[PDB]
Amino acid sequence: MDTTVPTFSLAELQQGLHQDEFRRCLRDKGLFYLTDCGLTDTELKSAKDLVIDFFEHGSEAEKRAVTSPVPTMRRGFTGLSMCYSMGTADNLFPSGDFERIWTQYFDRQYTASRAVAREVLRATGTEPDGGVEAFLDCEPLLRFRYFPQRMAPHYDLSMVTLIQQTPCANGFVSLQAEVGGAFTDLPYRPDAVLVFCGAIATLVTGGQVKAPRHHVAAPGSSRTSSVFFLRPNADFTFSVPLARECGFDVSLDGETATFQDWIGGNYVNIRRT
Amino acid sequence: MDTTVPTFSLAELQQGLHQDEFRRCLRDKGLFYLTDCGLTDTELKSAKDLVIDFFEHGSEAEKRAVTSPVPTMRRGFTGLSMCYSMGTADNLFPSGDFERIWTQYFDRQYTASRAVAREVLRATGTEPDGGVEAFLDCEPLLRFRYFPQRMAPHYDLSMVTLIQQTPCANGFVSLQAEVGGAFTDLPYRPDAVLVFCGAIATLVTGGQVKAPRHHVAAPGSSRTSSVFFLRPNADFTFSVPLARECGFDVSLDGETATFQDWIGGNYVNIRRT
């Protein structure tokens, strides 16, 4: 009945500690807080401050200069509530300190994400087709969103998703996840990042990892979130019969398929039941 | 102007009776009640009782044991309102009498579905590419849903869909379908199953069969439905120009395509206009 969202130290997992507790969490819950992963509250504030300054004080001209011509929220600025997005390349940076700060922040996120994904693979004895490092050298997307003073349940289609929130001034907890058949609060932890396992973790490990559903509840209620999707390459290859065995309703002829075969030609980050 | 949802006896259709009335119904309405198809109210109650018992009385542990790690509603239990899903293989059965009861129920549904699909093909002089039996040896999905005391209009992308409902205690009729340009009640019939023709019937027969839109209206209002989708294999092959002729807005290069080419790498069961 234990419906508590656990916390693991990345460093401790890397030492081979708590493997049973970790495997069990992955199987039964698919989400956890992660400490000791190089992701500090002080840095979150560094990056958050300068993007919030851009959101509030950037001109329409400065904003347009870092807005994509198609409004995909893949790179640069998106007005909706506002978002800033980046990946490993093709970024759009406002002038000044922004690029140095956000490149470093992105890098630390990407490293942490690969590192925890590596532990998810290790804990489940999983060797992706083509090898672990090729699998993790992938197609990440970071999105930073400001929400002024709400979201339908879905599960993520990432390998893993890392989430760093800033809290509502009034102390309301917006993010919730299904745990043990009940929606459970997922509050800000100045000391920890939240990790959701995505459908790709389920797929790659042959069903050893749960992709939990989550949502944001409606109620000083403004908040921001940094969401880092670790997304596989288009050519990530998996077994078709094995996908069917763990609940994927695939329409795929023959025995192996790629991520592109399954999802199509545009990334899809989330899915509803 | 006759906007009445008709009923046909499967046995009678199999005898070659009412071919005109049947062809006309398929063309102009795309839905009908089906009697004499091996699907009894007593069996519906047998299967419904033991899954309702599981929904109400199963522990979170028992539920988790038959819940997929991705919440696709393909197999086993899904909490949302609750659902139980199954196909021809890879099933997740609660302990005891459940598996025997639900395997038999699934089988009778699958047989009825193939049998009526065979009559839809016969009535329209349709020989699917690769032959009738290969076409019908396919990828069915049964979903049983409990609705506590609502759904946007869509059409189904199945060949056919068979629906067995249990009624609201208060006698409200929830399911409705467009018939003759008007939404028409589709009440429980203890003696009959409701059949919707899906877009695949339209596609395979070269437009001889309508895929009607339907929805569920809001008002003792609780209800359950058993929905059996007869879905084609990924390699079902059809003519591209012929698909375009009957209203399919296909983006497909060249002259033939497969169901996977059209729909993509995950089954999609329903579509909105």
Add this chain to the structure above:
Amino acid sequence: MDTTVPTFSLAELQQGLHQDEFRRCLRDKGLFYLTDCGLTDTELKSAKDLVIDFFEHGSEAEKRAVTSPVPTMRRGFTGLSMCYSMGTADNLFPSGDFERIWTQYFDRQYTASRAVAREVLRATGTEPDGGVEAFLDCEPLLRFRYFPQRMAPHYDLSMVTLIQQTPCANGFVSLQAEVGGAFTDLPYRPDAVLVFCGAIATLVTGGQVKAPRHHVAAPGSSRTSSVFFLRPNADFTFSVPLARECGFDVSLDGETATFQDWIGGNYVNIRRT
């Protein structure tokens, strides 16, 4: 800061006038009114009158005769609010003067659309793979919609979309587009058609053209719109790295891809952020 939706004369653009103003509009706004393109208010009324007469006075039998068996809104009549759709072939025409009127109207729309698309390509120095004329000999869809006395923001996935509205009797302006970070009215112009650049303009020109988001606001509030999507052929081919550079979140292996590879096997006309 100039958030005004501009107007260009097609004839003048064809003369090579206003190239700077046109390039800038395409880059920063992605939409404009178009005059002198062979599309008269008198013709809009000719075609609108006879389809409105059909909507109001056509029998269910006449309507069924020009309704597709799948409710895709690709061709013929769709009851929802009502729609009439057509393309270059496979049309469904009510009896009488309708076909002559609507074929001529469609043709004038298609010509105007190709002509302005040709200018978008010229202004941006773009040579589509396979050449300009092959690219423009494509898969257009015209939809004419009556709205009785509302739509979420999206951008179009067309090359260009041409829109001819009829106004609300009461003078309410329903259609709005993001311009300079603000939603801007897009009123009826008896003398001009509205052109939205779509995501395919963005893609083909390597990011030189914006695909603006737009929506319809809620308030004599009835209105109609004629919407002509100029949509590429399934085999339209583009550079994968170049698509990524302009914000497309593609999951495509290797270096080139087709429109079908990206979008899948059914046209998708619109997308949300």
